[PDB]
């Protein structure tokens with residue numbers, strides 16, 4: 001006789017949500033929420049939080065490491081609406097996009113703003129810089145990125161978690177973290193000179 005579906009009892013006991021960052025060393029992991037628009041208006045499917053890890057073989061025609069970004073980019077053509085309609089996508093991944101994955105996406109976007117991505121990410125850590133190309137490209141080209149800070153954090157739960165008032169709490173680190181993502185997102189776009 002199971003208790004509640006509110007994920008927490010097993011993940012809590014098993015370990016300590018040590019769940020490292022995306023693309024750890026076993027398999028991807030991320031949440032994504034999208035909605036389909038019907039004509040000049042919006043529609044909300046019957047789904048809260050959902051996603052899928054690892055991809056399957058398409059037999060003679062496999063795709064590359066599609067990240068959350070391309071993930072929805074791939075769902076929209078899944079419902080196969082019409083044109084007069086629209087798509088308001090929302091991605092939830094403590095991790096932001098990538099130099100390339102961002103491009104792929106940005107295109108689909110820049111090429112057709114008809115899409116609206118609202119990415120809510122927590123923090124990213126890389127040692128590139130010049131590759132940021134896509135980053136500022138899919139971000140400006142039409143993807144709305146947001147740095148999920150303390151407030152947006154407890155909120156991130158309040159978004160998909162079966163408790164608009166989950167018991168999660170902020171740690172005296174969000175500072176360094178936020179700074180990193182923010183200072184960056186800012187930078188990459190604000191092309192912070194030398």
Ligand SMILES: [Zn+2]
Pocket residue numbers: 065066067097098100101
């Ligand atoms: Zn990627």
